[PDB]
């Protein structure tokens, strides 16, 4: 595996601080990062130019991983939705790629957000997972203003082995997640 | 008055009326009850008449519990028509009452008030009735 | 069977003898049906082609 | 007036045909059913309409297996 | 609640049972591999073979091929010939496939 600043920071500075702060008895009992699933809810490309390959290209550039499609589980009248119609994207990032993307997200992305005042503290799962949203894709460094055609945000779900929101917030803020409160 | 707000089927067969009551044979709410002695289909008009009579006797005060609800749809063919050509049209709703069911219960009223109100209520019914009070036999069920 | 769902025959491409009758949707499947059926005159498998009944 | 009701289908004469212990031959239909109210057991096949038929000559025997269902077998002779 | 593991296990095993043949049941751990021929008519195991009982070397693939050879050799001694391969929840590939190939190399009929 690759040598990364964020993974090394975890194993070096975040592990012992956590063990001290909570008093874990086992090495595995400590909270670890499990996965980070990114999902462009899209749905704007139902009809119109359903060719959403620009958005999937953007995701493949930001994550270094080609996303997959998501389709409708049912047809919906008001949403102009036919069952089985491609309406979104979802890429599951784990391990080294997860660390890479989280590094670039914490060091570049979250700063470049318009009127950024921190991440919402109450956005925790209750089981020890966190979620957030993004209004644009220009936030990430791999996306410039020329190669973009339309603004399209995304959803980020970070899944942690922690059991309470307390341990999860500890791990995430220690890793460098900026919380507004 | 009393009738179901919705049903799975509009018309029912007539069935039978044999046996004592399946349930509701013991007081369970009020201080007194009116219990049936002979089986019948008690129409919603009769139940409403009995209720109105009891509350009109109380004038104000007390509490009335109606433990039967008319869910059986009564049917009747149009006047002066011959047999056949379908089943009749629903003209009302009845409650299957069998021997030994408490149809009404009164609570929170003097003994004389409850007795006389249950009497005037029974006089609106198409069957013989008995006035009962809550016993430890009821309390044990 | 209707007007859009037609009945048809299958012809052994090798001896030109119709051997099977079936049905297709000419709107959902506007090409001639090609399959591989057992031709008994040839006593072997053969690609049969759709033929107007 | 009139009616829109009077119609029904010819009864289908379904059910068990060879109760447990009944000696049977190869091919005797054992059960007729919609769905798998009884499931095929040893030496018992099932057909495209859920019909259980004996695969060998023998004797019918039932076996209720709790949550696994009800099975019919043919003990060889 | 069942897991896809158990569902897959049931799904292949019932279709094995229906064929009324003896089943060479395979089990594959992270370290070793085990295989026993079962007659489900009596709920009895006839012949067993494993790398834990035969004390075998390193390569799990060649190890499984050797345990298959041993299982087939011990099976042909008891009159067994035809059998049905119980691959369990394991895809017929790699270690389990090598076990099956070793079993066939010993004369087992499947």
């Amino acid at each position: 595996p690759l040598d990364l600043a964020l993974k090394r920071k975890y194993y070096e500075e975040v592990r012992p601080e956590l063990i001290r702060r909570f008093g874990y008895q086992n090495v595995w009992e400590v909270p670890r990062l499990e996965k980070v699933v990114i999902n462009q809810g899209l749905g704007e490309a139902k009809e119109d130019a359903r060719i959403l390959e620009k958005a999937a290209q953007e995701l493949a550039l930001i994550t270094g991983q080609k996303p997959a499609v998501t389709r409708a589980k049912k047809s919906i009248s008001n949403f102009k939705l036919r069952k089985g119609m491609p309406i979104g994207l979802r890429v599951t990032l784990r391990r080294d790629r997860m660390w890479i993307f989280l590094e670039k997200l914490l060091n570049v992305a979250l700063p470049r957000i318009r009127d950024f005042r921190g991440l919402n503290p109450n956005s925790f799962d209750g089981r020890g997972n966190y979620n957030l949203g993004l209004r644009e894709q220009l936030i990430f460094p791999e996306i410039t203003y020329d190669m973009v055609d339309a603004l399209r945000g995304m959803d980020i779900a970070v899944v942690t082995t922690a059991e309470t929101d307390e341990e999860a917030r500890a791990l995430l803020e220690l890793l460098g997640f900026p919380f507004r409160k | 008055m009393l009738m179901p707000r919705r049903m799975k089927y509009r018309k029912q067969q007539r069935g039978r009326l044999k046996g004592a009551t399946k349930g509701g044979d013991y007081v369970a709410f009020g201080d007194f009850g009116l219990v049936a002695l002979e089986p019948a289909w008690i129409t919603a008009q009769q139940i409403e008449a009995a209720r109105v009579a009891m509350v009109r006797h109380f004038r104000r005060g007390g509490k009335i519990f109606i433990r039967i609800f008319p869910d059986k749809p009564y049917t009747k063919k149009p006047l002066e028509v011959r047999m056949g050509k379908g089943k009749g049209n629903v003209e009302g709703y009845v409650a299957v009452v069998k021997p030994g069911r408490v149809m009404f219960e009164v609570a929170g009223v003097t003994e004389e008030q409850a007795m006389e109100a249950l009497r005037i209520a029974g006089h609106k019914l198409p069957i013989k009735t008995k006035i009962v009070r809550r016993d430890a036999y009821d309390e044990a069920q | 069977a209707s007007e859009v769902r037609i009945k048809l025959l299958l012809e052994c491409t090798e001896c030109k003898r119709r051997n099977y009758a079936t049905e297709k949707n000419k709107r959902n499947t506007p090409n001639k049906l090609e399959l591989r059926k057992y031709c008994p005159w040839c006593r072997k498998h053969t690609v049969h082609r759709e033929v107007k009944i | 007036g009139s009616t829109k009701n009077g119609r029904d289908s010819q009864a289908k004469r379904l059910g068990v045909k060879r109760y447990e212990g009944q000696v049977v031959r190869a091919g005797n239909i054992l059960v007729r059913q919609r769905g798998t109210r009884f499931k095929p057991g040893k030496n018992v096949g099932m057909g495209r309409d859920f019909t259980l038929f004996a695969l060998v000559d023998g004797v019918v025997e039932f076996q209720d297996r709790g949550r696994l269902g009800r099975y019919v077998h043919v003990r060889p002779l | 609640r069942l897991t896809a593991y158990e569902r897959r296990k049931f799904r292949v095993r019932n279709r094995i049972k229906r064929t009324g043949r003896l089943r060479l049941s395979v089990f594959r751990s992270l370290k070793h591999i085990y295989a026993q021929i079962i007659d489900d008519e009596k709920g009895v195991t006839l012949v067993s073979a494993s790398s834990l009982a035969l004390k075998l070397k390193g390569n799990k693939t060649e190890v499984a091929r050797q345990v298959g050879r041993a299982l087939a050799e011990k099976a042909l001694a008891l009159g067994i010939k035809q059998v049905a391969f119980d691959r369990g929840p394991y895809k017929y590939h790699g270690r389990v496939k090598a076990l099956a190939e070793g079993a066939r190399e010993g004369g087992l009929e499947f």
């Binding site: 690759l2 990364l4 600043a5 493949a60 550039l61 270094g64 991983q65 080609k66 790629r97 890479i100 590094e103 670039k104 914490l106 060091n107 570049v108 979250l110 700063p111 470049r112 950024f116 005042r117 921190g118 460094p141 791999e142 460098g176 900026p178 | - | - | - | -």
Partner: protein, 69 residues
């Protein structure tokens, strides 16, 4: 992974405007950014860019204390 469908990750230099350099991995080996976490106002303590005013209203008038008393 599936070969031929993923943009290759390579060692990447992410340069910030404040002079911060970040050694990471990305599809573009060099990327310049206008801001990073080491110089954003919310991160670096409370570097309130222009407005660290104090409201300043309303009692901050005090022009002046010349009315008689």
């Amino acid at each position: 992974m599936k070969e031929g469908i993923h943009p290759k990750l390579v060692p990447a230099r992410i340069i910030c405007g404040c002079g911060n350099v970040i050694e990471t991995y990305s599809t573009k080996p060099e990327i310049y950014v206008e801001v990073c976490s080491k110089c954003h106002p919310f991160y670096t303590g409370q570097q309130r860019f222009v407005d660290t005013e104090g409201r300043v209203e309303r009692f901050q008038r005090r022009y002046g204390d010349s009315y008689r008393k």
